[PDB]
Design a protein around this ligand. Structure first.
Ligand SMILES: *[C@@H]1O[C@H](CO)[C@@H](O)[C@H](O)[C@H]1NC(C)=O
Ligand SMILES: *[C@@H]1O[C@H](CO)[C@@H](O)[C@H](O)[C@H]1NC(C)=O
Ligand SMILES: *[C@@H]1O[C@H](CO)[C@@H](O)[C@H](O)[C@H]1NC(C)=O
Ligand SMILES: *[C@@H]1O[C@H](CO)[C@@H](O)[C@H](O)[C@H]1NC(C)=O
Lengths: 121, 123
């Protein structure tokens, strides 16, 4: 039994999907959720550097959002742990070529989903 | 619970694990390195695998695990003929991936390399 779904990319105990199309942040989340996954929950610098190597030049949504004055939260609503900086004053995070940035959630970008591999309890 | 499908520093794709080198070696020394890790120079088995390697590898040329006798069909490391899933340019004896596709050169040239092997959940 494969650790990751067909055409997804395996790194450590996680599985990643890089989109071909563009969507706004919420619709990308809906796509990831339909496949038992979330917008990429990036948990370490190593993970970030893996994603940046693969992603290519397009901006890619990840699974961090905030209310404008509040801290960044993971998809589950837990406050995120600041493993890398995020540029800007936007409500929705994405990966550009230098790291993490932010934008209005209604903009259309490619996206990354992540999920644990199936052999995780 | 369980264990990672691939070793640390290897990337998973379609039931295999891939290692992208940071150093350079000739084709035979690159293969010796892969062998030490129970792996082979990448046995590229699809157009989708080709695209995956081109996308992850970066700007450097990387050796892969196809070779041929000068004038004959490309062979995998196990000696059996390759199925021709894409073009391989050039008149060289040993295959590699450049910035755009698959090409070929003299086996003594020093380049980055890619190893592949099956993930642990195979069998
Ligand atoms: C919420 O999600 C993040 C990233 O997936 C994880 O690190 C964190 O522990 C989670 N907290 C929960 C489920 O309480
Ligand atoms: C987000 O995308 C969906 C799907 O295309 C669309 O229905 C919706 O209007 C979008 N939201 C905004 C604010 O444009
Ligand atoms: C030779 O290698 C190719 C590519 O990995 C594969 O199709 C075939 O199974 C191999 N032959 C063996 C293991 O006998
Ligand atoms: C490849 O390079 C190594 C240096 O590590 C050298 O020892 C070896 O003989 C070379 N062999 C071939 C076949 O090119």
């Amino acid at each position: 039994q494969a650790a990751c779904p067909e055409s997804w990319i395996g790194f450590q105990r996680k599985c990643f999907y890089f989109s071909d199309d563009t969507k706004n942040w919420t619709s990308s989340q809906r796509f990831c959720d339909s496949q038992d996954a979330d917008l990429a929950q990036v948990e370490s610098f190593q993970e970030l550097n893996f994603l940046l190597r693969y992603k290519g030049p397009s901006d890619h949504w990840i699974g961090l959002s905030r209310e404008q004055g509040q801290p960044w939260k993971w998809i589950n609503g837990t406050e995120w742990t600041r493993q890398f900086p995020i540029l800007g004053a936007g409500e929705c995070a994405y990966l550009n070529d230098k790291g993490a940035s932010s934008a209005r959630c209604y903009t259309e970008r490619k996206w990354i989903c992540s999920k644990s591999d199936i052999h995780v309890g």
